[PDB]
Symmetry: C3
Subunit: 491 residues, 3 copies
């Protein structure tokens, strides 16, 4: 009953989490959170974005109107999902700049198509083929009009179509490439055709291509597809002496957040802002490792599969030398605070959380948590990131852009966690130290630091006296004479 002991301590937990810092790759903290999303449900949620499942229709085939894609007439989407099993079932074609036309239609988000009354005099219209069957019958792309001779004549076609609305019109037409010279003249009479499609500030000028090619659905002929945008006040002109595969009208163009993704993931009823080819994913985390291909408000793709952000002090079951230092050891039995006090006196032993120091640590970690978890990444139509054919220069640059980006983000994420972690350990160490010092300063000359986080208080200090220390109102003058006597034999 002549002295007391008061020791400062901090909590610890039986199972901690290993995190990475600036100086240690493996240091144990009381608690952490995962910043990389690395899993998916495997399914694409159908809200909030308007998902159109292309099923066995590539957007291009929907656009041209391959008979097996008629259900997609006038459809709209925020995201068109294109499946890899999808195939073409009409006249064989190619699209110079396929990727661009697929991109610009993807991006526009609609197949809304308006028929117009092109006046095609002196040709047979509605040319059809065995390669584009409707049931047992010859057929063709719904949105195009294959013209051939009437009788023995294919005249110079020369028609116009003014755009008098105040949206942009997308026209999609083509040129037919016959197999032989015989075929060119049987169909179009002239030996060399040409197709000139123009506006007031643009043109396209195409000569047909001749030769035997491999049969696709019975045919060696082909069509190359071309497109033209006609602005308000402008006009489409089409001029041709053979081989024209005429548009029937225009597609409406829109701007907005629409896009296209290659995925075989099923569509499901649920809500997710972020879509990948592997399925929708949560965007509570700032990073993800699921896929570099995303649509919507998503974590940023990084190469790491896990990045643990520390949310607690170091676990002992820093710059200041208190935690894992002169305080030998955490207290697992302190479960209502991060920091506090154990005492021993005449009336027995006890333990109290310190609230102010506990809150200061938690506040500061919440602050870096709020900065870090506060999501800022919403992207829609972007670039292609996987490729089905080898191409060279353009594809090289596309991959290299993305590869560059991913390494830069991966690095920022790696650094950020290592920094934030070092700093969390150290600021938690600091708060412990600051409490100890605050206590030392209250004791003035009535106590000595025992070297282990505890002070020997050189006077009778009951539970009320000890509380006075914990709440910061200890009055050292009251006890000085007594203490100095025990401490130094003064009087």
């Amino acid at each position: 009953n002549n002295t007391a002991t008061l020791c400062l301590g901090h909590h610890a937990v039986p199972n901690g989490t290993i995190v990475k810092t600036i100086t240690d790759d493996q240091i144990e903290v009381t608690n952490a959170t995962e910043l990389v999303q690395s899993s998916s449900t495997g399914k694409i949620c159908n809200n909030p974005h308007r998902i159109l499942d292309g099923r066995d229709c590539k957007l291009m085939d929907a656009l041209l109107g391959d008979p097996h894609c008629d259900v997609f007439q006038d459809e709209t989407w925020d995201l068109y999902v294109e499946r890899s099993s999808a195939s073409s079932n009409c006249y064989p074609y190619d699209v110079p700049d396929y990727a661009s036309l697929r991109s610009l239609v993807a991006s526009s988000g609609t197949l809304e198509f308006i028929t117009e009354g092109f006046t095609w005099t002196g040709v047979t219209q509605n040319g059809e083929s065995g390669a584009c069957k409707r049931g047992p019958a010859n057929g063709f792309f719904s949105r195009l009009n294959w013209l051939t001779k009437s009788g023995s004549v294919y005249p110079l076609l020369n028609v116009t179509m003014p755009n008098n609305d105040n949206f942009d019109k997308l026209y999609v037409w083509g040129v037919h490439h016959p197999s032989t010279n015989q075929e060119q003249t049987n169909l179009y009479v002239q030996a060399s055709g040409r197709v000139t499609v123009s506006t007031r500030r643009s043109q396209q000028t195409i000569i047909p291509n001749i030769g035997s090619r491999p049969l696709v659905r019975g045919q060696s002929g082909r069509i190359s597809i071309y497109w033209t945008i006609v602005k308000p006040g402008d006009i489409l002109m089409i001029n041709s002496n053979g081989n024209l595969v005429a548009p029937r009208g225009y597609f409406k163009m829109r701007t907005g957040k629409s896009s296209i993704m290659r995925s075989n993931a099923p569509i499901d009823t649920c809500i997710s802002e972020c879509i990948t080819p592997n399925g929708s994913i949560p965007n509570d985390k700032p990073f993800q490792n699921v896929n570099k291909i995303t649509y919507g408000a998503c974590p940023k793709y990084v190469k790491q599969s896990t990045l643990k952000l520390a949310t607690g002090m170091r676990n002992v079951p820093g710059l200041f030398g208190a935690i894992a230092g002169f305080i030998e050891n955490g207290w697992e039995g302190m479960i209502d605070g991060w920091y506090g006090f154990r005492h021993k006196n005449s009336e027995g032993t006890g333990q109290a959380a310190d609230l102010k120091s506990t809150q200061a640590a938690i506040d500061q970690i919440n602050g870096k948590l709020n900065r870090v978890i506060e999501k800022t990444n919403e992207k829609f139509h972007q670039i292609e990131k996987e490729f089905l054919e080898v191409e060279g220069r353009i594809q090289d640059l596309e991959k290299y852009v993305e590869d560059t980006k991913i390494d830069l983000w991966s690095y920022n994420a790696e650094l950020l966690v290592a920094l934030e972690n070092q700093h969390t350990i150290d600021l938690t160490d600091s708060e412990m130290n600051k409490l100890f010092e605050k206590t030392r300063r209250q004791l003035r000359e009535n106590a000595e630091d025992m070297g282990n986080g505890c002070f020997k208080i050189y006077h009778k200090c009951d539970n009320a006296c000890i509380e006075s220390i914990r709440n910061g109102t200890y009055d050292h003058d009251i006890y000085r004479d007594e203490a100095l006597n025990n401490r130094f034999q003064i009087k």
Copy 2:
């Protein structure tokens, strides 16, 4: 009279500034500075860069020699400013890869055109048109030479021009597409023409397509513009059996800092390194929010409109627990230093700045200031970042590259300020602590820490005595017996 008090503390100002740190979204420091440039005069300064106002001439029209653009002949520039009201008033034309021709001329910085002694045998030269009037007369592009039949013949043209110089020559030439067959033969006799322009390492062939395009300034025909760069030692050769629109010469090519910008900002007499479409901007700050399109030594575009870097300590009207810690509270009355001393003694009271500690904090903050505002970014011709027409793949990539870059820089800026600010707060705290500990150490056993940043000095300590503490020459043996006697009653 028989003891003194010496208190430490630090300055404070009535109204400080709110900054962001690693741990707080909002925390007040004495002084801060803005790192985002977000305003502009609206006007483009005419030095130190050579600014050429294109007015109503697109560079393309200046290049080709639209008669309304004659004043631009042989012009030079560091930056050609292109206006939106600019329009074309010559023969209607298209330029496949318009943007490459525009880019490489913009980058070359010059329209210096050298006229060469081309021989066109058997053809009529200087064809003209109602679409490209020169006063009351029909006219044409100054830089091109429209060739037509002579009498009843248009010969196979085969003409060459060696490059015997040590610089690259840019040849701009064209191909004429007539309206009808009648026109093709009236002009060129041949039913189908053709141009082939070749060097030892390159060849281009264009076949014109006859036909009607929309009436522009009275004309249905068109001209398409192509280009060839001939290296030193190489030879230009031109081959044509009709439809050639010949070069009269070439443009000198330069490399350097030149570029082109779209803007309607007026030009003004002033000095700015950095130009944006919105006007020139100062470049003392390291970031800006005005426009992603810049020319010259510019702050880097970031998404944030403001980012305040702290240039002073925390304002109290840290890891170390001194400032806003055991020192309750700053001193508004301390105006000649950041840190100092106040005392109560025998001869009255007083205050003095500590210079060493004030300087060390200031120096450290100036150090990071120099790092951060040190102008390092000078960029000239880049990629276009705004587009008037939809194009697909290539535009997608250009937008993605810029948007990637901006996000990465906005991040760097965000983190930097957050880091710098946490560390400034903490280093200013440390300096206060270091000074207090310095003082405690000098006092030895002659004073006691009162716990609030002050020492009770247990001896008569007059102004000279106090000064000896502030200048670090206090001799504790002189006072020790006196002090130990008042603390401990030794005598």
Copy 3:
């Protein structure tokens, strides 16, 4: 003889190294390491990567089989090295999209060529030219087959080659453009030729353009080179009635780590993972200034020539105020630890290293060293980064992408060293201070801090006594009464 002195200290060296920190552009530490590789031996190491010296053969000429390039038949490479002096010595040619064909072959990493069973009925094979000699004899590209008439006939050629294998095939073929009409018909009999090469998914039809181009090795004609990829299950057709320069077979395509590099550096025996055009470089450092063009596991290209990373404490021949603070000064004579103890007692003076605290500093710096120098960047085929022609849009973008990337990495490198440096100095200061405090704490009331890193120990303290302090077993109760008596004159 009734007291002793015990000072704590740290090492120093006469000449240290200057580094950059957050707050000082120049401050001296004991030791540092360079993080930018700036030297090369100048030679390209021939392990571990398979390096193929193109010598005087551009890869394109090895691919087509220029007679001077027969030694490259069926060759493979991880890196094909292309020399400046390399030249073409065969029929002069051009390759639309040359760079993609060169890219995709470079990336495939092989010239393995499989001859196939094309049946050329009615025509003569193996056309040769004086412009492509094999010694004294006229010759031709080995991989191509120049077809011409047989007797008085050249028929319409129509062949197929199915792909029944499970890999992709690369077909490289050409079209000959004669200099005159005479030549056209002597060779091919038709006045105009045509080559149509097709698959189910693609068609290319080239019309030769007759006429003179500049004489190259005695020839005014040219051949144009095209390529077609045939996937498994698909079918190559070739259809032509003149001017076809046919393939003899195909090149095997592969995916993997191959590329091509332009360099005049000699190849030689050594081992380096990272290749630049200047020669190989070590990859122990995380950045390099040698060249933005690299192959293999390389340090990342940055703009700075040097970045010195501190591996040691501040050198004195911090946040905490010990090093270059209350310890005036380091000890050059302390060679077997970073921190330690000097004393003076009755038995004389001495000195001893502190191992725990030395290790803790070292360990933590080793840890950030391992984070930093951990080689994590391995790249192979990328984008071209230097260009020999002006091109416009695409090249602008390519340059912009690499320039963007470099400035971001150079920023990360600058920040990293400034951060880690500030932090190293601070953590080394901290460890000093922690040792001081540890020592203070053991001494309890038996010593006083002299203000300069030393303690006055107020009792007889022999060498064994001193060692008890250094090893942490000093028992203060043995000495307390004696010490209080000399400090005060009391207990």
